[PDB]
Structures are given as C-alpha cells and as structure tokens.
Write a protein that binds this ligand. Structure first.
Ligand SMILES: O=C(O)CCC(=O)C(=O)O
Ligand SMILES: O=C(O)CCC(=O)C(=O)O
Ligand SMILES: [Fe+3]
Ligand SMILES: [Fe+3]
Lengths: 296, 288
C-alpha cells in the first residue's frame, strides 16, 4: 500500500468470523492479537447499540484538567440488563467460546474462564489518548511471570461504531506478548519508552479484535469533532481470578434463568470444578451454587 | 538449651494478646506461627456445638483412594450455621491486623477477602494427607517462587485438640523460602522423602497462621475415637476468586448484620467486584 522504501508498520492479521478457530488462534499466538471481521453481525451490532443507547445518553461526559486522566470516555457495564441482543446472542458466540477454551480450558476441567466485564467504551470527540498498558496489569503480579506466564485475561474488543485512526481506534503493539521482560510502560521502568511502535485496529461495526492480556496497547486520541467511537469490550479471565463486576449480584435472577448453562457459568450463577493433583471455584459447600439458586 | 547440645535442631508460639508486628515478624521468618487463644475458650465451645448437627449429617468416605476426603469431613456453611462464628470469630481485630500486613497496600483499603470458612474434622483411621502448598489452588503461583507475592493465608484453628496421634497438621517451616516451588511428589520434588516436618500441637482456640507458600499436610489419625476438628479461615488477595460463592449462599439477613469489613470479606461489599462504577452494596441495600 505504501511506496517502496517506506517503513512498513506492524501487521494486524485479519480473518472473517467464518475462519476456523484454529486459524485465528494461530495468529493470536504469533502476534497476541488478531481481528475477526464480522464477529457480530451488522444487524446484531445495530440492535445492541440501539438497546444500550438510552443508558449511554444518561452517562455524562467527564472533562477534567489532567489529560493523563483518560477522561471524555463513557463506560457502561450493564449490558446484560440493558440489551436482549447482548444476553441472547452476543455472549452466545461459539467462535468466542472456542477461542476462550483454546486459551483457558484445561483437560477434563470444564470451562476455564468467566467474564471479567462487559463494558461499552465510547471515546468522545477530542478525548486524549490512553497510556500504553497491558490489561493483565489489573492483576499486578502477572507481569513478573514474563512471556512464560499463563494467560490472565483476554478481550474481544468489538467495534460498535467504526474504528478509524482519527476517531481513536486502539493502538496495539503486536508481538509485545513475547518481549523478555514485562514492565509498566513508563520512563523509569521501560527502556523502549517513547520508542514503541503501535498500529491502529481499524474495524467496521461488528468486527472485533481478540487481544491477549500480555499485549501493550492504548486507546487512541479521538481527533474528530463529531465521532463518538463506541466499543464493546468482552473481557474474559481465568476462573481463579476475581471479576471486576459482581454480575451475579446485580443481574436479576429472571435473566439468569434465561441463560444457557455456559452463560450462567460466565456470570457466576453456576460454579466450576478444578482438579488439584488428586475442588469447586465459586461453589457452595461441595455443590454447584446453581442448586441453591434454583437453576437445577 | 532447647535441644540437647550436639543434636540436630528440628515453629514459634505467641498469645493472641501479643502485637501483630511480633506475630507477623515470625510469619515472615518461618511462613507459619501459632497464636494461642486466637479464639476464646467459650467461643470455640459454642462454635463446635453450633456446627455439630451439621457435621453429624456428613457421611464418611472410606475409600483408600488418596484424596483429601478419605475419612475427613469438610463443611463450609459456618456463617449460616453458627452465630458465634459470624458474630464473634470473624470480628477478631488481630486477624484483620495480620491480614492488613500480608495483603493491604497504603491508600487502597482492604486488600483481602475470604476464600473459605471450612470445618475440617479428621476421622479415626484417616490416612495422612498429601504434602502441599495451599497456593497450588491458584496453579501459576508456585512458578513465581519465593519472590512472588502472597496468594493465600490460613488461620487454621483447633476446635478439638491437635495431637501427634489424631492428625495434627505437619508443617514445614521455611519452605516458603526454598528457591524452587514444585509439587511435592517423588517425580517433581528432589527433596521428596527427606522433607522435615513439625506437627501443630494445639488446644481448642489456638490457631496457626500459615502462608500459602509453606508445605504441609494433615497427619494420619491413628486413634480410635478422636475426631480432630479444625476451623480454616482461608483468606486471599482481593484479586482472586473464592472457593465459596458466599454472597449467593449466605442470606441477606445475615449480611445486614455484618460490619462493613465483614461484608467486604464475603463480597456483599466492593475496583474489583463492583456494579458499573458503584459499590455493589448500594444495589444490595446495605449502604445508608
Ligand atoms: O478503548 C480502547 O480502544 C482501549 C480500551 C482499553 O484498552 C482499556 O480500557 O483497557
Ligand atoms: O486438616 C489439616 O490439618 C490440613 C488441611 C489442609 O491443609 C487443606 O485441606 O488444605
Ligand atoms: Fe486495555
Ligand atoms: Fe492445606
């Protein structure tokens, strides 16, 4: 695309949502991130945006006097409550669960993952760029295991409205999941500070990128005047890690009863069973918590 | 003069009235430490009585299969079953004092919450448990070695007395400072078979605070009638998932009677475990 002799920026691989999960996972392993085009259908993504739009209108845009604050970005996590399309269809992506199993699920131990968050992230016009970071920084000890550590968290980060370089599409650093040392990206700790090359995740509505918690990234500057850049972050963690949202305590049981068993597991309405040499996480005295809740 | 001069020397003891800094210093040195009278004598007796009808309804497995349920009863509904547990035992200021030093960072509130409230009662004849570190439950933790942060700690309280014969836990002090944290088996542990233990001999109300990095295991209960009953207060970093879904099983009535700090321990109160920017205690009806 660029004239010969031009520097070539890093490559984000792209696959259709009809590609095999093995093909997409291979790219995720090589680079730490990969675009899945059509992850959500344009009709599903439009119904979702319409369904969460009243709640987004009620959230005020926060403007502050520190640019390093990551302001002018609306954030909304009650996707299940607000959106039938989200809870009936979006969280039922088999391709999403196929990839989560290839990341998180251990032999004969059931689902190895659950939801960390379901966040609509709408970056307002003029919002400053977000600091470069790894998402596993949320679990502060994880970087110390280096690239040899297991996965903490992954994110299916979906374009709800278009992602462009101008409106603040996430800037990603492919291959940063393989750097020898994982530090915070600051002047004191990161030798490459200020010299780190990123690439934007350009996406159409319904596209998503799957991104390892080991990948350096940061929301871009929204340099536009009118583009509210809407995203949906499906953040998925190991079953042994604590979620950012107490979904089982805020999502009503009426909606829990309508969930598939794997979706109840995702939100903590149903337990999981790990094997330690010769134990339930999130259980109830040896039983699945789903018994006590009436979920059978 | 603690062992005969010339002999090989083979676990410090403090009273609950001692300072948390003194108990924590020994905890840092050895990875475990006894706190005598951690729960008052009348409290542990009320507790034991209060959970005895729960324990009598637990059938005993006689399996010879080598897992931790072979002739060992385990029960986790201590808040539901015991007023003494939820009203007094969990409201120990020292427990929180020590939890703050293990887990909390300045300006960030409580850095810890409950993993489990488990009554463990080793039945007569139960084989000894496998040697393990409690942080094996979070399976990547050993890979960080002794430089890694603290994962889980356990206030392991004697409910009936612990003897060398009825199955008192065998501890390996200082195993939190070994250079490699491995599984403790013949295949993975070069020191297997030569690992030196000390038993945790305790009266009712005593406990030992143990680090999740310390190797240990329950002993064989070679007796005929002694059901060695224990109470394990497993506490984890706030970033880690509990083994019990306490905020879904403990009724809202009892949560309303908890202090703000106990609500946080059970997840009735929230960073992590929030509700779309707000404390989950708001939606639950727990903030004034
Ligand atoms: O909004 C974006 O594009 C990035 C958001 C993000 O990376 C985060 O919130 O951790
Ligand atoms: O019962 C004991 O003495 C030890 C039990 C224990 O360590 C466990 O179940 O994790
Ligand atoms: Fe991020
Ligand atoms: Fe143990």
């Amino acid at each position: 695309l660029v004239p010969r002799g031009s520097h070539m920026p890093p490559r984000l691989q792209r696959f259709p949502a009809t590609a095999s999960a093995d093909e997409i996972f291979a790219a995720f392993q090589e680079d730490g991130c990969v675009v899945i085009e059509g992850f959500i259908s344009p009709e599903q993504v439009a119904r979702f945006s319409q369904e969460v739009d009243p709640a987004m209108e009620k959230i005020p845009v926060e403007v502050t006097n520190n640019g390093n604050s990551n302001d002018r970005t609306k954030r909304f996590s009650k996707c299940v409550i607000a959106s039938p399309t989200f809870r009936n269809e979006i969280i039922e992506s088999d391709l999403m669960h196929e990839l989560c199993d290839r990341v998180f699920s251990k032999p004969g131990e059931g689902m190895g993952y659950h939801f960390n968050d379901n966040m609509v992230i709408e970056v307002q016009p003029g919002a400053p760029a977000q600091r470069l970071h790894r998402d596993q920084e949320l679990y502060p000890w994880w970087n110390s295991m280096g690239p040899a550590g297991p996965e903490c968290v992954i994110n299916f980060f979906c374009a709800v409205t278009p992602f462009t370089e101008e409106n603040g599409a996430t800037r990603l650093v492919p291959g940063s999941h393989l750097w020898p040392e994982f530090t915070q990206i600051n002047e004191r700790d990161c030798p490459q500070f200020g010299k780190i090359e990123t690439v934007p995740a350009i996406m159409q509505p319904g596209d998503c990128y799957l991104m390892s918690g080991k990948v350096i990234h940061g929301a871009g500057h929204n340099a536009t005047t009118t583009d509210r850049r809407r995203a949906l972050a499906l953040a998925i963690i190991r079953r042994e890690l604590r979620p950012m949202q107490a979904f089982s305590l805020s999502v009503p049981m009426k909606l829990a009863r309508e969930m598939s068993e794997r979706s109840q597991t995702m939100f903590g309405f149903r337990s999981s069973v790990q094997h330690c040499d010769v134990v339930h996480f999130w259980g109830n005295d040896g039983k699945d918590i789903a018994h006590h809740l009436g979920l059978i």
